[PDB]
Each structure stands twice: as structure tokens, then as C-alpha cells.
């Protein structure tokens, strides 16, 4: 995990480039930042479980019929 | 690292019916777990084939998107082969999604979670383990 | 560069009997061939339930150290999902493994090399050819 | 509960920072480090602090390392 | 039977061929394949000449693929 | 760039008490750290035998994805054989792990860090660092 | 491909006796067999103390050039560590360098050859073989 | 295993770049060729097991205590 780098700065704010061998999930379009002493932390948003236990259900005909052949 | 599979069976049980003792062995283990792309194949034809596909690929997608999806490789593929043919020699039957499934984790050392345990216990060199 | 998918077909077809316009066939269109993990899932299994399985693993080495192996991946399975729940509509069946190397092929656009076009017909918008 | 964009710059992911969770002024060197989809952004030369400061093993953990000998 | 020396070239290991197993002069590009420590040099476009008439499947090959169906 | 190797003792010591005077010591010298592969095997277990696992590898992880991880390779293998023949000559006792630890860092020319020295006094031609 | 990891108990008793139905199983499978680096550091060290080192270790080194040898890597050392405690939760006893063995061949899914099987049949999930 | 190439002649022969896709072992350093066809094949130098189990054989001392510490 270890990678250094330079913080540059956007049109707005401080940026920081992700090295390769450092760089999130691709898949990962939107990030919650957590501020813990001079260090920053970032986080894929919303990937808990708890909000997706809680959240959206799939419709009750979505079923165990798995049709694996046998 | 990753440590856990998921097997399809699971998977369809926890979408399904989100038990809470499922979510806490998901809350521990968030980062240590994954589906091969076989699992991925089988949601995305259960989603396709429902009355509200577009809801029910929204719902498959928030679940995916905080798993790691493996891509069922040459590894997977050879470990599945082995394992088609040491149950055929025995007698034991599993299904094809199944077999391709234990090799794909057989093939990367991972432990199965699954609940259809009884299948799966017939598979060598694979550690089981039910969260349900 | 690539082009053509190997069906598990055609290539155990190939591999059982080595026919000889299929050797000029595979010479010619070298670099342009390849098969899905799927089908080395079942060349694999055929050696290691025969009866002289590290005999007939090194045919297997040649055979498939001269083409690509491509990972199932998340676009196959999307894919494959989609092919599924399409001959739920048609109400045509196909086989397993087979509908995973369709989808397989239709996530990549390569052309489906067969010996056994009947199958894959069913299935809508693919380029097919046969090769035997 | 400050949430953000990811950027796609020098063929890489990068990070908008907003003003309200800004490092300071201090830093100009940062090593990121890599655990599941988190990255963790320290001040070089402050690697550390934030292991250090943050969570812990529990009680029992390798009370002896069981090397024969 | 004939013996040979590994070269090291163009940053790869490459293989001096000495006259007596020389390929013919027809052939300028070659594929080379990989299986296990040998590797397998055939003009390109002859690829799978070596495969054809070489070693061969036990009879008892796959006599049924075995997909359910 | 690499420098220290740090040794089980040391890492456990760390990971467990978490001293001040530890932390200035690697704050200071990030980039230049690294572990055995053994020695990772070893905080991996006592996570693992733990009545809090996933709790203990989530801190393992921090710290191991802070350094460098060296495979044990055939170089270590040599000078580890070395060393215990070594140590037969002089008939002085050293734990399993902690030999292959030591052959690693001469294999590659590195400087054991640790909080206990007694151990590795005892092998030859290693620089040895006690940051307790 | 690789297939089979050998255990150091089978290499010591093949170096030995160079028996001919072990010759006749390396023939069959050359190849498709492996040591953990683990391994070669124990030989090593036994040719390193034995009186004709030079000797021996030029026997070690033509039986290890017929060899692929793999690097005690991450992976070997985690499943490693999982395996320490599988066994020490269950009380079953194996040694720290068949463990380090067990869990290599695991983490990459080789087949363990051993005759020392009674050992090793103590670890899970794990495919073990006796070729002597 | 797939990979093309073009040969090259050197002062006294043909030679063949092995790109890094297929090169060997660089363990390797003698190779016996091996001509089928118009097909070359190599192979790394007295490498099958009958020449290690009819050849050379370690002391007597070489033993099986093996000092796994227990």
C-alpha cells in the first residue's frame, strides 16, 4: 500500500494523483473524505451494508427457481 | 485480502430475505469477500428475467458494487476441470454453476460461504463455511 | 487482432480426431483465435477423467499454448445473464457451458468457430461459422 | 460526511479536496497507503500517526508467538 | 541429439541454431510456443503442424462432453 | 532504497503496544522498512488464533500495507541453510522462524531491526538494530 | 502447468533412494511439480552440514534444476497463518515447515505430495498424495 | 505460449529472439534442438530424471534427521 506523492492543487481545492499500484476501484466514482488529524481519509461512497440492508428491495418474483440444470 | 467466496445460493438468500445474522457476518468480514463472475452470470439472468428487471439490476448492482467480482480465469478453470472429474470418479454429484464456483475458489485458496453445504462438502481441498 | 472464438465443439473435435482441413484452417488464421475459460474448463475435465489424464494434459498444453484464453468476465456474464433470460423468451434450450460461451462471444464480438451450429443459432445476434 | 468527486488526471485517479477537510499549509509530500477501498492520505513523515492514533488489537492478541524453542 | 548454446539478445534470451538443424531458407518470421521449459519454433503460418502430426489423445478422450442437456 | 527488515519481535511489540518512541522511529524512517514474508505469517496467525479476528487482521493490514512485504525466496533459502549449519558449528540454539528471518536479511543485505538483539547475536555477518 | 507442490520429506526420501516408483510418477508428471522455497532452504542446509557439502549440494542443485521452484510469498504466509490456528483450535500438531509447505500448496491450490500423510491430512482443505 | 518473431542470423547460424512472453527459464543456459518437420524444437539441456536417478548420488550422511524442531 505504501506510495508517496505531491499534493497539487485544482481550481478549487487541494488534489492528490492516486498512483498505480495505490489507485482505488475504477468502479469507484464518488468518495466521502473523513478528516482524523492531519491526515485525510477516503472512502467509496455509500458501501455499507447497513444502507443496503436497510434500502431498496428486489421484487418478490426475483426467486430460489435457480434453474441450475440437473 | 480477500478470504471468502460466495456462492450463488447464498447470495440469492441474502438479496432475497437480508437476515439480520447475515449482516453482521457481512459487516465483519466487509473487504474479505467476493463472487466469482459465474455468481455475477446468475443474478444479472434472475434480474433480466423478472417483472421489474431495471429494479431488481438496481437492487443486483448496490449489491455488487461492494463486492469484488473475480473473473472465472484459466486457474478456475483448470481447479473445475479436477473437480469434474474427482466427483465423477466418486460417484458425488454438483451442479455446473456449483463445480465452476468451488474450482474458481479452490483455484484461489478461498473459503465458500454457502448454505448449500451438503454439495459442496463433496468438492477436495475446499473449506466450507454457512452464514446463514 | 483477435477474431474467432473456439467453441468447446470444435475443439474437441480438433483435439479427439486432428482433422486435417482443420489443420490448414487453424495454420492459416493463427493469431486470430481464442477460447473462452469456459470450454478449457472441459478440455481439461476430458483429460483428468481419462484413463491416461497426464497424456492427454499435454495434448491440452499445445492445443492451447498456441491460442488465447480469455477470462469470463463480468461482461460475458452481463452478457450471458442477457442470452439466458432471451431463450426464456424464445422457450429454445441450450446447453450450460454453451450459453456461457455465447455471451462470452457477444461481450467481445468474436465470431463463434464451430463444429455444431445448431445450438448457437438460437441465439440472437452472433456471427457463427463451421469449421469441420 | 464530507462526500466528493474522483478525478481522472495524469493517467491516474485523483481527488477533489474540499476547503472544509483541507491538509494544511505544511504539506506539500503525501503518502497514500492502501487497505481494502480505503486509501489513507498522511503527510509524508507522518505515516504513522494515524495507525498509531487509531484502532487497536484486542487484549489477547499473541500473548506468546508459540516459536518452538 | 545436437546440443546447443542460449544467447542473450535484444534485452531476451535468444538460441544460436547450428547448420545441421537449421530451419529452411522458405522461412523468415516464426511462431514460438510455450509448454512448460521447451519451446516449439515453426514458420509462421506452419504453427500447428508440430501439434497435428505429433503426440495424440488416448481413445477414450471425451467420449461425451457431458454438459447437461 | 529499502534498509531495515523489521523481525517478528519488533512487529508484534509494535502491534500489540503500540510505543511512542516506535512511532517517531518509523515516521522517520517510511520508505525504508520492510518484513519477511515469515514474519508475516506469523502476525497473520496470531490475528487468526485471536478471539477477535477480524478486528486484528483490519490491524495487521494497516500495518503491513505501510512496508514492504519480500517474498522468501531461493536466496533467503540459501543463506538460511547456511546459518544453520552455521549455527551447528557453533552449537547456539535459534528458533525456526527467526533463522529463516535472519538468512532473508542476509540474503538481501539488509539491517534487522528488533527489541530483542540476544537472538540474532548469535548469526554471523548481520547488522542488527535494537529501536525497543 | 503447475500442479503438484513436493513436501520435503518426499524430496529427502527420493534424493536418498532414488526408489523407481517415485522415478516413474516424476516421469509421468514432469513438469507439473514444484517445491516451496521453503523446501530448498532444508536441503540446503542438509547438504551445507553434511561431510562432501560441494558434493551434495551439486546432487541438491541437479534435483532442483528439474524443479520449479516457488517463493514462500504473501499468499503462502497468510494461508499459513490460518492454518497455524485451524490447527491449534483443533489441537492437532504439524510442524512449522510442513505448515509453511501446507499453506503454500494451499494458497495456490497445488496438490501436496507427501508420505508423511498423517500429518498433513490434519490440515483443511488442503488435496495430499503419496507417491512413494 | 503463442508469440511471433522474425529470425536472425548471426555470425555462424540462424537465432531466434524469445520475447518475454515465452521466454525460458533463464536458469537455462544449454538447450539440445531438436529438428521435426520444418519445426524446431528446444529443450533445456539434460533435464529428464533418469540421467539425475542413475547419476551422481549424496553421502550417506545426507539423513533424515531432518531437525524439524517439535
Given amino acids: 500500500g505504501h506510495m508517496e506523492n505531491t499534493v497539487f492543487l485544482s481550481n478549487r481545492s487541494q488534489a492528490v494523483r492516486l498512483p498505480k499500484a495505490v489507485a482505488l476501484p475504477e468502479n469507484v466514482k464518488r468518495v466521502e473524505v473523513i478528516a482524523v488529524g492531519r491526515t485525510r481519509i477516503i472512502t467509496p461512497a455509500g458501501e455499507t451494508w447497513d444502507e443496503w440492508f436497510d434500502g431498496n428491495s428486489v421484487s418478490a418474483d426475483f426467486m430460489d427457481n435457480r434453474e441450475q440444470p440437473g | 485480502m480477500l478470504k471468502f467466496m460466495l456462492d450463488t445460493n447464498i447470495c440469492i438468500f441474502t438479496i432475497k430475505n437480508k437476515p439480520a445474522s447475515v449482516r453482521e457476518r457481512f459487516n465483519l468480514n466487509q473487504g474479505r469477500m467476493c463472487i466469482s463472475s459465474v455468481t455475477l452470470m446468475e443474478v444479472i439472468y434472475g434480474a433480466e428475467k423478472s417483472q421489474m428487471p431495471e429494479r431488481n439490476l438496481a437492487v443486483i448492482e448496490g ?70
Fill in chain 2, 63 to 132: 449489491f455488487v458494487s461492494r463486492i469484488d467480482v473475480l473473473d472465472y480465469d484459466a486457474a478456475a478453470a483448470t481447479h473445475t476441470g479436477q473437480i469434474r472429474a474427482e466427483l465423477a470418479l466418486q460417484g458425488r454429484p454438483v451442479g455446473p454453476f456449483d463445480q465452476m464456483i468451488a474450482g474458481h475458489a479452490r483455484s484461489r485458496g478461498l473459503i465458500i460461504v454457502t448454505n448449500n453445504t451438503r454439495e459442496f462438502e463433496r468438492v477436495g481441498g475446499l473449506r466450507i463455511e454457512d452464514w446463514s
